Symmetry: D2
Subunit: 247 residues, 4 copies
Amino acid sequence: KIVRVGDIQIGNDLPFVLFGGMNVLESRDLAMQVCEEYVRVTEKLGIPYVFKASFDKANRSSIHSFRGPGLEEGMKIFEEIKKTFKVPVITDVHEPFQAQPVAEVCDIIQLPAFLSRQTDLVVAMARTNAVINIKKAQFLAPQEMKHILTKCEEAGNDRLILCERGSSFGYNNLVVDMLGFGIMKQFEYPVFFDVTHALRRAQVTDLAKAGLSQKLAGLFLEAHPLNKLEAFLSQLKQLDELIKSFP
Amino acid sequence: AQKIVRVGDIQIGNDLPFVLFGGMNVLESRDLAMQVCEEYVRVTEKLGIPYVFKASFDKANRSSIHSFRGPGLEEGMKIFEEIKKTFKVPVITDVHEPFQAQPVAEVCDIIQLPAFLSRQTDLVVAMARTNAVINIKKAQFLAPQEMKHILTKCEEAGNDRLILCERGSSFGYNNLVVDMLGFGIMKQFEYPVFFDVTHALRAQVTDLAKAGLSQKLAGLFLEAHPDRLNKLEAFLSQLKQLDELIKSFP
Amino acid sequence: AQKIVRVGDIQIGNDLPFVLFGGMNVLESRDLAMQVCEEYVRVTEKLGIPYVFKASFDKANRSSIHSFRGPGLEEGMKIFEEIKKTFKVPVITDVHEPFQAQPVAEVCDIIQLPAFLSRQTDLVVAMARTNAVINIKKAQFLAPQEMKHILTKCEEAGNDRLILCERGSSFGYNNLVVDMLGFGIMKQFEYPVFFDVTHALQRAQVTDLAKAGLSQKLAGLFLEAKLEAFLSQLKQLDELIKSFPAI
Amino acid sequence: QKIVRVGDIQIGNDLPFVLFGGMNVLESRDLAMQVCEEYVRVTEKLGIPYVFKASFDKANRSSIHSFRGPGLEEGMKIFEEIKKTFKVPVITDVHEPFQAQPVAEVCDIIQLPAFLSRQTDLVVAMARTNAVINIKKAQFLAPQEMKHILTKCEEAGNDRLILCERGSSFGYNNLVVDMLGFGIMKQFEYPVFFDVTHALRAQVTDLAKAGLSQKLAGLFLEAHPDPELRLNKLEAFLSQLKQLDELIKSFP
């Protein structure tokens, strides 16, 4: 029900926790800059924070023309971010062997939606007793999440978080079914919602709001310099406080 | 520009406090309706929620024949006059055959175009004559953007007093999903945007209504019964609180 | 066991050769109604394909209050009487209001119950009372098994001369996808099942779907318009699929 | 319209359909050869080109425990037998990039799983082996989106591609097959297959007839001795499909 990561506490009954950061570690310079701006706002408003970014992008369109810095170099950037900002990090691992080294640097490891069924990957990630973030596949029903949490508990990892990213709706279109948050919460694991990955900036705000009204452990953001974050997160903190106060 | 629609002392719009279209599904008995309306008027007066009473006089799109449909038109419009007298408060019902558009609008301030029938011309025009306010139900197979053409018809049939209702969307077979992004898109057409929470499917109703209201909406559509009605106060409290928050955001 | 619906000297049935319900969208003009039907009778006569002329005397769902609607009831009937006289062919039309069911069923052999109006009791009942053939249109939001209620309504109201007709299902927004398994599911109710090839759209594409729909062993086709070559392939296909013993 | 040749088998949307049939997974050395033998007898007797189908690992499942298959090295020895015994090409699914290379050494056609059809590394590894790639269409991807994966293979060294249809997402835990999908995917000129058994009763029969009426290059079947399709009942059903394929193919 509650998941501790350093000193940050994560639960559906607790104030929401930002998972914000980048799509991909472009450079060390941007990683630090993005991360610095995020801590500044979140510390101002009193929102517990974790830095998000991939080191590897699987779904690219070229043999080698930019998945990001890779396992060795990405890990060195996460290591520097942890030093400077004393903040937990989160990244997603793609191949089974990477889970072990990555869990040593990264506090939370993410389980990509497309690969969420692959047994071997699940187990590799569970072995590391680091906290696993299960991304919910767009062709999957909330009930199906139970089996993914089971393999995890059977491999002896019971620090798990569900992160919703929207269901498939006809061709190419996605819809976020809000009743799914509820069905997922019965599993007693913290639930998150990925807002940027579920689809102007008007939409992102509306959808983020609509997610927190369902009473969630937290949120995903890929923002990039944005720097209009203060107005946005404050409304969310206000709403979340209202929402979590309800019997 | 955002649009404001006015009825018997009531301000309905996307930027204003949310309005309740609440009552019962169908007019079962002249007595039961009073009961329900009474309980509604108590909580709404308290919470400062502009309330309109809601109930259909005929359940046409029935599942089976010989099933209870309701009191019919005339029988039913009487029961509407009684609630309207006793509780001094507007009424909304759905009208199914074009001919009944005028008698009904004599009694009811607001008339509701049923989803299945939203596409068909004769009835739309018939409601637009009555210079009443037309509650347009969105159908589960219509895209939000497609609401534009129903808006257009009514405007061109001589009514500019319009509300859109979201009722849900088709999601495989016998399942409905409510796209939150839809409200954004419909809000652009100006005209208040309401949400039917009941007909979008216990406590899933509370979740869904909360999700709705976060989108900054003109009002809710909602159904209750003594066999539910009892836990109305606790439910609308939270909602109003949240609405107070969303509507104050700059 | 499977039901045969008999209209004129024509048999309709999921086992009997397919029947074309071909014709036009709206009765544009008398002369234009005659022309289309002439071309249909000739081409369907040449091949071995039972034919029934289809058309609307009223377009109730047109976008804009001012856009052409058709000849209306009395005028619409006079063009159907003329078609009957000239071509000695049964007709099908859709009925929009309860009071129409009788005068229409006096001229028209088959009456069609449009989707959207497909659940209104007062029209279904009105239409069943006329002892014409009911062509029940399948709504794109309604599951195939859901067609029992509409059938039952009709049966109770005193009419078992029924046909279900498939126009597609809602797939996300605006898109319609035709669930081939639907035909099996509706087939079990034993009334003749048709497919609306044209209204399953929004090309060669109409042809492909027509082929796919006919491979499921169907009472007929619903088509609006080399028509001759189109049907000839379909006639051959219908012949192959219908000679197949059960596996 | 391209034509993919494997051994003496022509594969193509204008050509006679090709059966990619076998079983779900290599439950054993024995059961493999029993399924293959039945397919081969009915194949020769009907004269329909045939490619044996079996997975060597069931990489995703519900529970971690128990059965997933023989494994890579074990599983390929079965494929060694089957090739040697019955003179028939084989097809399996590759799940990780390091596998594509030793899998192609034995299997004539490799299958890029639906879920992993987007992950570049697997695609590239496979396209290096020059063996035929059968790209599974993802349940959440529009037929139009199959161009990018084709382009990833062809720009990578390999233009011997098959597309495959497994059904699209239709609500929760439920699928529909879009028939207009076939005619869209065909516009890319590679051959297009339908996986009737992954698209979900004898309603597999009905789907296959539905697919084959779209003038496809071919089709997927799984059949078993005892389901915990029936392996002994293929002839009457494959026969019906050939007469239908022969018809659909003859049309101008």
